[PDB]
Design a protein around this ligand. Structure first.
Ligand SMILES: NC(=O)C1=CN([C@@H]2O[C@H](COP(=O)(O)OP(=O)(O)OC[C@H]3O[C@@H](n4cnc5c(N)ncnc54)[C@H](O)[C@@H]3O)[C@@H](O)[C@H]2O)C=CC1
Ligand SMILES: NC(=O)C1=CN([C@@H]2O[C@H](COP(=O)(O)OP(=O)(O)OC[C@H]3O[C@@H](n4cnc5c(N)ncnc54)[C@H](O)[C@@H]3O)[C@@H](O)[C@H]2O)C=CC1
Ligand SMILES: [Zn+2]
Ligand SMILES: [Zn+2]
Ligand SMILES: [Zn+2]
Ligand SMILES: [Zn+2]
Lengths: 376, 373
């Protein structure tokens, strides 16, 4: 518990694929040079974590999952001076070393720290010196996307976290760790929505809803929300959607319907679902000449685009953590919440003990929730 | 308004070559101009028309890249008179629709078919034709139909140019040069000091190299499977050249290694399934941009991971130029030697020998063959 000593605490480990999480007692070593050890206060489950338990996907085991959270600094490694015990922080999967070609360009938010560009979900699986800080029943355990928040205490790289306001409500600002930021920024930075434009958002979960918030703040005059589960519409409307459509209850392809309603198509579209049908429709429903499609979610490995479509004016791009330069922007999003610029409360549907983590996973797998807050 | 009797090339059906025939050309009506063609070239698009695998209409008068002079104008026309030099084109700018008014695109409300533009603008504004042969009415092609001594076009499809222009060279502005030059400048938006890659070294790709250089690029890589295309590439601005058939590793991997990560802008002026995939792969992460110009296949497949990691895709239409307003400017640049079009013309042949010009192109032996009368 105290500095320099190994800690023993609760956690949830995935011993192998296609299986539920087990509650165990583990040992968390102290931080080394350029590392920080955090006490996790609140955390949520994200579809990216569950995706790791899918047998048809690539992943490593045994591992400690989790990447959306908020907490407090317990101790820091040798030579560290930008962090100290007591400070409130928020870690993330997108690093910002501030010391590379990519970090210097205003055209991207990627960083030279990343190594795998074909399978990012298995990158950052160990610390810089290529060793692990986790141990359980003798065996060494893998880290997950540089965070691993499903443990009371974790250790991260200085390039993977930021200090925030001393009076921040950690049981809510934890949403800034992944979901909210990714959707909000996709609209503002990646798609670059403009005043008076028309937008279309596919998928109404935490990401899609945050994208609607972003479009409204950017000044769009019309926002069309699409989802196969109609029960998600009321919450979308409370946040800014002006129209709603269920592909399942329509006679014609949903894109043909959108095209009719707008007399040609929308200026900007964002896919926050990621299926073969949503990706195709997201492109189809934009106006020719200057229509823009931004990819956010992706459950499939590829998309097929007709050649005549780009020749006629349509373009395609995608986002990574909402396009935010992580270390510099996260503090600012926290300040915005303080000033009531947007309400993170509507994104929370459940609250439960960390012990019941497996129930939160079922709820999400059943589309009966948005986000569930877990606490130790 | 007399009817003119002249010669022209007609395609009667799919699967057979063009036939030289004697036809009748009617006088121009309101908002129309009758042009005397002085020089015309053959473009890959004209050849696709007779391929049974492609969609097309028959019988038709093909051709769409040329330069010429005004013979006569229709009732009420005042911006044109007999003797003026002009250049027609497939991308209209009617200036009486909503799209022409927008600074976000170069498309126009005059267009109707967006899945097969090669069969659009097949008749005039009033839905009738101006061509006749052996008692049969004949179709127009993409609003131009240049394979004829005389043709008639809508005022939204041409522009008057400098009185001293050399019509035997500025004809390239009608399609090929403008499309490649503009793809780099307007569509890809190449910037000073950047690195680019151009796939395909025919008229369009060479013009893209000319455009990259004028925009300020510091490095220009040229790729083609036919090595005889290299000497002209270097004469126009290429700094490095690569032939896929003489490399063991895939060409996109060679480009990535020679640049330590890839290029800032790529332009596909070939359009095969292999070039489209390579054009995307050879761009840098974070901000790499791929622009589609050529297109031999109907689709392209993009990996989800690539767009998430910063790569983007777009495409060009007549180089992004507002046709009526920009063509005259391009003619002026040539007059002032900003670039040199003479290097793009490799042969000349009498109009009656059109079929020999087509065979020359299908053997990869030429860039552009000018046809004269
Ligand atoms: N690009 C990046 O950096 C990030 C990507 N993501 C990804 O974004 C996606 C969304 O995340 P969440 O909102 O948290 O997930 P979620 O599971 O809550 O959202 C999915 C929603 O899409 C709907 N849907 C499913 N099939 C549909 C169809 N055919 N048409 C319309 N709607 C359909 C569902 O009914 C549901 O409401 C995930 O795939 C996630 O991994 C999350 C964070 C960052
Ligand atoms: N988007 C638009 O508005 C326009 C599009 N185009 C299109 O652009 C294309 C090119 O036109 P041109 O230069 O006149 O044709 P071309 O036939 O002379 O040019 C093709 C060139 O690419 C090369 N090539 C073929 N396969 C290759 C491969 N795998 N790797 C590298 N090089 C390869 C050939 O050897 C040849 O030199 C056509 O498909 C044409 O229809 C032309 C004008 C405007
Ligand atoms: Zn996530
Ligand atoms: Zn960096
Ligand atoms: Zn052409
Ligand atoms: Zn118009």
């Amino acid at each position: 518990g105290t500095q320099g000593k190994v800690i023993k605490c609760k956690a949830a480990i995935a011993w192998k694929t296609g299986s539920p999480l087990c509650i165990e007692e583990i040992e968390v070593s102290p931080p080394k040079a350029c590392e920080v050890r955090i006490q996790v206060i609140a955390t949520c489950v994200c579809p990216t974590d569950i995706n790791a338990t899918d047998p048809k996907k690539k992943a490593l085991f045994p591992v400690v999952l989790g990447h959306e959270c908020a907490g407090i600094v317990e101790s820091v490694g040798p030579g560290v001076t930008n962090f100290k015990p007591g400070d409130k922080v928020i870690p993330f999967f997108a690093p910002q070393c501030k010391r590379c070609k990519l970090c210097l360009s205003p055209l991207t938010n990627l960083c030279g720290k990343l190594r795998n560009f074909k399978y990012p979900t298995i990158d950052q699986e160990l610390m810089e010196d290529r060793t692990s800080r986790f141990t359980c029943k003798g065996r060494s355990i893998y880290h997950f996307m540089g965070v691993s928040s499903f443990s009371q205490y974790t250790v991260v790289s200085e390039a993977n976290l930021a200090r925030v306001d001393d009076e921040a409500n950690l049981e809510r600002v934890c949403l800034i760790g992944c979901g909210f930021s990714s959707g909000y920024g996709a609209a503002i930075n990646t798609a670059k929505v403009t005043p008076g434009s028309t937008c279309a958002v596919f998928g109404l979960g935490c990401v899609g809803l945050s994208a609607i918030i972003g479009c409204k703040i950017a000044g769009a005059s019309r926002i069309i929300a699409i989802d196969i589960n109609g029960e998600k519409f009321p919450k979308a409307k409370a946040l800014g959607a002006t129209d709603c459509l269920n592909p399942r209850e329509l006679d014609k392809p949903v894109q043909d319907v959108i095209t009719e309603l707008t007399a040609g198509g929308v200026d900007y579209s964002l896919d926050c679902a990621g299926t073969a049908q949503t990706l195709k429709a997201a492109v189809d429903c934009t106006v020719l000449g200057w229509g823009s499609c931004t990819v956010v979610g992706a459950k499939v490995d590829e998309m097929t685009i007709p050649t005549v479509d780009v020749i006629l004016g349509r373009s395609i791009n995608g986002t990574f953590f909402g396009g935010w330069k992580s270390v510099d922007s996260v503090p600012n999003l926290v300040s915005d919440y303080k000033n009531k610029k947007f309400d993170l409360d509507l994104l929370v549907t459940h609250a439960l003990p960390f012990e019941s983590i497996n129930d939160a996973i079922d709820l999400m797998k059943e589309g009966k929730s948005i986000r569930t807050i877990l606490t130790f």
